[PDB]
Structure 1
């Protein structure tokens, strides 16, 4: 029997199959098999080829992706795709008319389009081009311009800027159609006085002079972008007149200082909900805006507003939660931290004050997945008191106490981690367990939660894994001060609790993180355990999430304290286990995990012989406002300046004398600037500490290009193996 080797991991020799589908109605869904796009009936399982992979053989461009209009009539061909940041990019587009079997050839969508999206019904298009918004009521009709103010790196209409893209919307898009198709709401961003990060991009050998990349990026404390909201009426567009935009002013509690627009959710055809958050993320407001057919304007009755405060920490897991509106848009449901700081579901009625908790307990609700008039379906880590497990639940809207678990028992030994995808109106649902066994895709009717069929069992991957000495995962918990904190171990094949093994500590450790879970990974850690017999361990300590505010907020205004502290205490416990050679304990982490890995190696605990830190953060003034200020406040003497400076990696350099440290960073990192690792290395040199390094030309935070990804794991494997006297 062969082991799970580094090549296996880098070459992706053992692939996980997936069943990713798109619900197209209350009972159909699309699925792409062999580059053929098929429609499926959910009740019966029958299918028809909707678009045959042969269809576009003579197109003249590699087609990167596709989007089909809600009403099945047209399809968008995305090509010439060029990636910008995490979510943002630009591309070329073409539209194919189905019931005509041809390409619309005039009023073509412009090249270098930054965003496109169908109205939720029919076949309208909104697109963003040169930071300006455009609308095509019909695919071959000339589009109407919505905004004229757009300017590169300065004014953003309909798309986010760098920090809203990354920290607020987790999307490039800033465009929300009304469920109807009538209204197109859009955000607008002004970065006029936001400071630029600048770095060299070397590009192909053939480029003589390096290019300097300039990106508006507010470092913690810096001037943030400002934001405006507008709603356009897409029916009354004059080919003759400029479309007129109605602005929705932020609440007064917001305009008294820096604030972010943090959520946009349409409730009815004529009601829109806007959520806002203060620059100090202590305090958010939900506005509710109704449309006046007489006026033509939108009004956010002040008395309607819902206010969300937190005194122990910040608001939300990462942001104020999403509202789930009932059909008549007169009520809605929202995840809220309860009186014991455990996150639960709340029932809100519009024009009533306060709210009602429909769930409670020492566990947390991850998400609301579907609403009907009888049932709310949600995900949570309640089952078997395991914070790292996930299940599908429904609660009777008529009787809160009548809560039933849909996923808990389907395969209790293979599946303890599910996510879900419902059809419109919630007739059917696809479940997806990620572990601890192989991933399993199942379909279900909602009427009597009966299993219709298996969609993907990963039988093939299972077969392969037979011939391989796979490692196992333990998932237990230690006790620190009469509290449970969870941990996972990727044990080597043929594990023996008598023999001593070297242990690599895998950390991320960031606010609301979770590294001990029941999901099945094939990763580097897998190779390390299978082939090199290394026990790779992860631990969720103070500040980790999904265990209520007590734990997750321990770290508030104090990054680089308990979570660092606890990665170390955890290690201690781990030597006390009779199979850990404590002379061979490494640590390593990426991004936030790298900041932590560095603070650990620099603490002097003596526990760790070595570690790697990949694209770490080194000083919180170097990271972005929205994320950093969320946990740290502002870096001023009036706020939290002291701990900002007490919490840097540079100030710990001396102790790095005690360990072999490897430091890695991509030169093109637009997120955690190479700066951060530059300052780390300088501090080390300025104090005479040897250490090892490796920079990656033109790689970003992900160091995810094929070559680079191969190279970095290779380099890191060499380092760990050397550090462990491994053959």
Structure 2
């Protein structure tokens, strides 16, 4: 009788999840935007005050995209004229409002088209990047000091990353790192001089007569990579009469012998900085720990304080070497690394000691270190109940590792099995964000005795609306394969009846270290498919998936397009044998890496799938970037791993597509997985006489997320799936 969750509900966002994004400004207070007003909250009592009026900038003219209060609450950086670039990069215009004198600064303002800006960690200094060069402002209203002068579009990047470093290494545009108290400003410099350019058309509005050609330095597998240099400058000794002096910290000799990457920068103390370097063959990384020499004014990194991290079974770290977590005095540090059994755990290092000591162990993994005090280290792991798709917050006593306490496990076991956390400045307080299997729940806690102070947001409004809807349920479980358990999830239609046969859609990603089977609550396309079309949407984490140890994750090392593809077919095979699945109506779909796997599956000749949809798929690894591809595949040379590069393409399986229905989709302005990848798939299908469905999205990138494109792609795929399953 009640309505179902429809395609329109998903597309129009009828049912919204409420959140509670706060920002810690001290060890006791946080900012929260309410009614467009920014309020300051006292964590102990829950009382608040208005920090900034939503009306204060009424006659500002420009539409503010975001704001950023200086650490000392004295200034607020206003961001506007936002123009997106890649996944993290963008340029904007900035203005600064003096909160003390309630006045907007008009002298020496930050330039327009600024690529990145950031307050110093303490006080109110500024460091921004413009035209690829670094600038520092000791005071909001004072003239800025030019730090670098080599900045050159698409060639030299100071303080910001190029395309590949942004996407595959730092997951940020930013390549600036303020020392703890703001004395030093460390930055990286990238040189893409010999990096080939990916070129593609951009059509723009109808009014543009000639299409524009976008050119982006983008190193494909085996190509020339950007080179990197690291520098540290003293912002306390800057002169208006002399060009600032930047001190360079060179990479270790073991890295200089060949191509390499700078993969991590983490300050230990006011005068100690750590950096990790990664060889192009990503199974060997080195950590340098460098101390400032007050006499010479140089930075020295004692060889005795070097830390090597390598792997024999695969690459290093999940996507890159993990970040260290230094103690107060910076003499020791905690870092997640795979142990001798292949599971990622916390190892305790002494800076000038080679062997580290594991403080956690077991057939499960630590996801991340979240906070550290002299008595405790707080972290998230999937240990609880052995569910690799669950996440809980734990604390471990540094003086006795046998004492591990779970802080989120038992708060509400039925509703919450997946948490992330946010600690205040000195870990005095923490916010728990539960996101599944029930509706998101946000809470505030105090560390001293782990008290549950109060509920910030429980989504009771949403829960009330969802009561009048026939919502699907989610089953999370596992199947066995060679004495190994692999998890999967099924979004089951409302009133699931195991005596009936339901068509089944396999939602896949399956890239290395991926996880598509978890306890997270989601309102997405699958929700509609199961609620309205009574289609079962399943996902499976096979070989190559993460958070279950290296034996599983490294199974596809140097072998992409093999086991993770085979395991998806196996899962579907097993699901088709279950009583509630109509083995005549089984489909598969994926986006990005999932598009690749979906394509490899459809072209495998397995006969298990009737149809499938691939969105922006990778088609041959030589078309994807160096940093990510080489991480798993090595180099595409005959002496390294070229053969597997050549027979792991979608194109080579073209002929096998004759017995399935295939829908191939891709945005023409995809800067990540180039349209080229789908252009070559379609040509190969054409070459063997295989008919298929296609859709390109003019000017859309990898996310095909503009409002209209988003509604259009999902509307189009819905028709395809319904048609494939013979649904009304």
Q: TM-score range by the shorter chain?
A: over 0.9
What is the DSSP-based 3-state SS (H/G/I as helix, E as strand, rest coil) of the residue aligned with 2:467? helix
| TM-score normalised by the chain length of structure 2 | 1.00
Alpha-carbon distance in 2 for matches of 1:550, 1:91: 45
What is the CA distance between 1:482 and its match in structure 2? 1.2
Alpha-carbon distance in 2 for matches of 1:587, 1:498: 23
Alpha-carbon distance in 2 for matches of 1:19, 1:642: 50
What is the CA distance between 1:419 and its match in structure 2? 0.4
What is the DSSP-based 3-state SS (H/G/I as helix, E as strand, rest coil) of the residue aligned with 2:380? strand
Alpha-carbon distance in 1 for matches of 2:358, 2:483: 28
What is the DSSP-based 3-state SS (H/G/I as helix, E as strand, rest coil) of the residue aligned with 2:9? helix
Encode CA deviations 1:136-194: one digit per residue, 9 max, x unaligned.
00000000000000000000000000000000000000000000111000000000000
What is the DSSP-based 3-state SS (H/G/I as helix, E as strand, rest coil) of the residue aligned with 1:425? coil
What is the CA distance between 1:662 and its match in structure 2? 0.3
Encode CA deviations 1:655-704: one digit per residue, 9 max, x unaligned.
10010100000000000000000000000001100001000000000000
Alpha-carbon distance in 2 for matches of 1:708, 1:434: 28
What is the DSSP-based 3-state SS (H/G/I as helix, E as strand, rest coil) of the residue aligned with 2:401? strand
Encode CA deviations 1:602-626: one digit per residue, 9 max, x unaligned.
0000000000000000000000000
Alpha-carbon distance in 2 for matches of 1:571, 1:180: 55
What is the CA distance between 1:713 and its match in structure 2? 0.2
Alpha-carbon distance in 1 for matches of 2:292, 2:531: 61
What is the DSSP-based 3-state SS (H/G/I as helix, E as strand, rest coil) of the residue aligned with 1:55? coil
What is the CA distance between 1:299 and its match in structure 2? 0.3
What is the DSSP-based 3-state SS (H/G/I as helix, E as strand, rest coil) of the residue aligned with 1:303? helix
Encode CA deviations 1:344-370: one digit per residue, 9 max, x unaligned.
000000111110000000000000000
What is the CA distance between 1:642 and its match in structure 2? 0.2
Is 1:141 equivalent to 2:142 in the alignment? yes
Encode CA deviations 1:68-102: one digit per residue, 9 max, x unaligned.
10000000000001000000000000000011001
Alpha-carbon distance in 2 for matches of 1:554, 1:77: 48
Alpha-carbon distance in 2 for matches of 1:202, 1:333: 50
Encode CA deviations 1:287-333: one digit per residue, 9 max, x unaligned.
00000000000001112100001000000000000100000000000
Alpha-carbon distance in 1 for matches of 2:500, 2:648: 38
Encode CA deviations 1:382-433: one digit per residue, 9 max, x unaligned.
0001000000000000100000000000000000000000001100000001
Alpha-carbon distance in 2 for matches of 1:649, 1:639: 21
| TM-score normalised by the chain length of structure 1 | 1.00
Is 1:222 equivalent to 2:223 in the alignment? yes
Query: What is residue 311 of structure 2 aligned with on the other side?
Result: 310
Alpha-carbon distance in 2 for matches of 1:689, 1:154: 43
What is the CA distance between 1:266 and its match in structure 2? 0.4
Alpha-carbon distance in 1 for matches of 2:552, 2:100: 57
Alpha-carbon distance in 1 for matches of 2:399, 2:45: 31
Is 1:567 equivalent to 2:552 in the alignment? no
What is the CA distance between 1:134 and its match in structure 2? 0.3
Alpha-carbon distance in 2 for matches of 1:564, 1:80: 44
What is the DSSP-based 3-state SS (H/G/I as helix, E as strand, rest coil) of the residue aligned with 1:141? coil
Encode CA deviations 1:220-265: one digit per residue, 9 max, x unaligned.
0000000000000001101100000000000000000000000000
What is the DSSP-based 3-state SS (H/G/I as helix, E as strand, rest coil) of the residue aligned with 2:263? strand
What is the DSSP-based 3-state SS (H/G/I as helix, E as strand, rest coil) of the residue aligned with 1:100? coil
Alpha-carbon distance in 2 for matches of 1:34, 1:280: 51
Alpha-carbon distance in 2 for matches of 1:540, 1:5: 27
What is the CA distance between 1:563 and its match in structure 2? 0.3
Alpha-carbon distance in 1 for matches of 2:358, 2:103: 53
Alpha-carbon distance in 2 for matches of 1:275, 1:154: 24
**Which segments of structure 1 move beyond 4 Å, counting only runs of 4 or more?**
none
Trace 1:374-393 onto structure 2 (pairs within 5 A): 374-393=375-394
Alpha-carbon distance in 2 for matches of 1:656, 1:579: 27
What is the CA distance between 1:34 and its match in structure 2? 1.1
What is the CA distance between 1:716 and its match in structure 2? 0.0
What is the DSSP-based 3-state SS (H/G/I as helix, E as strand, rest coil) of the residue aligned with 2:329? coil
Query: What is residue 299 of structure 2 aligned with on the other side?
Result: 298
Alpha-carbon distance in 1 for matches of 2:305, 2:383: 33
Alpha-carbon distance in 2 for matches of 1:188, 1:265: 16
What is the CA distance between 1:575 and its match in structure 2? 1.1
Alpha-carbon distance in 1 for matches of 2:354, 2:499: 61
Alpha-carbon distance in 2 for matches of 1:64, 1:282: 41
Trace 1:544-583 onto structure 2 (pairs within 5 A): 544-583=545-584
Alpha-carbon distance in 2 for matches of 1:98, 1:615: 46
Query: What is residue 436 of structure 1 aligned with on the other side?
Result: 437
Alpha-carbon distance in 1 for matches of 2:309, 2:616: 35
Trace 1:261-660 onto structure 2 (pairs within 5 A): 261-660=262-661
| Contiguous gaps of at least 5 residues in structure 2 | none
Alpha-carbon distance in 2 for matches of 1:382, 1:80: 45
What is the DSSP-based 3-state SS (H/G/I as helix, E as strand, rest coil) of the residue aligned with 1:399? coil
Alpha-carbon distance in 2 for matches of 1:343, 1:615: 32
Alpha-carbon distance in 2 for matches of 1:180, 1:725: 64
Query: What is residue 126 of structure 1 aligned with on the other side?
Result: 127
Alpha-carbon distance in 2 for matches of 1:117, 1:377: 27
| Contiguous gaps of at least 5 residues in structure 1 | none
Alpha-carbon distance in 2 for matches of 1:188, 1:470: 51
Query: What is residue 36 of structure 2 aligned with on the other side?
Result: 35
Alpha-carbon distance in 2 for matches of 1:538, 1:314: 25
What is the DSSP-based 3-state SS (H/G/I as helix, E as strand, rest coil) of the residue aligned with 2:426? helix
What is the CA distance between 1:46 and its match in structure 2? 0.7
What is the DSSP-based 3-state SS (H/G/I as helix, E as strand, rest coil) of the residue aligned with 1:413? coil
Alpha-carbon distance in 1 for matches of 2:106, 2:484: 65
Alpha-carbon distance in 2 for matches of 1:238, 1:9: 56
Query: What is residue 152 of structure 1 aligned with on the other side?
Result: 153
Alpha-carbon distance in 1 for matches of 2:535, 2:592: 23
What is the CA distance between 1:115 and its match in structure 2? 0.4
What is the CA distance between 1:533 and its match in structure 2? 0.1
What is the DSSP-based 3-state SS (H/G/I as helix, E as strand, rest coil) of the residue aligned with 1:627? helix
Encode CA deviations 1:587-615: one digit per residue, 9 max, x unaligned.
00000000000000000000000000000
Alpha-carbon distance in 1 for matches of 2:233, 2:211: 43
Alpha-carbon distance in 2 for matches of 1:503, 1:310: 39
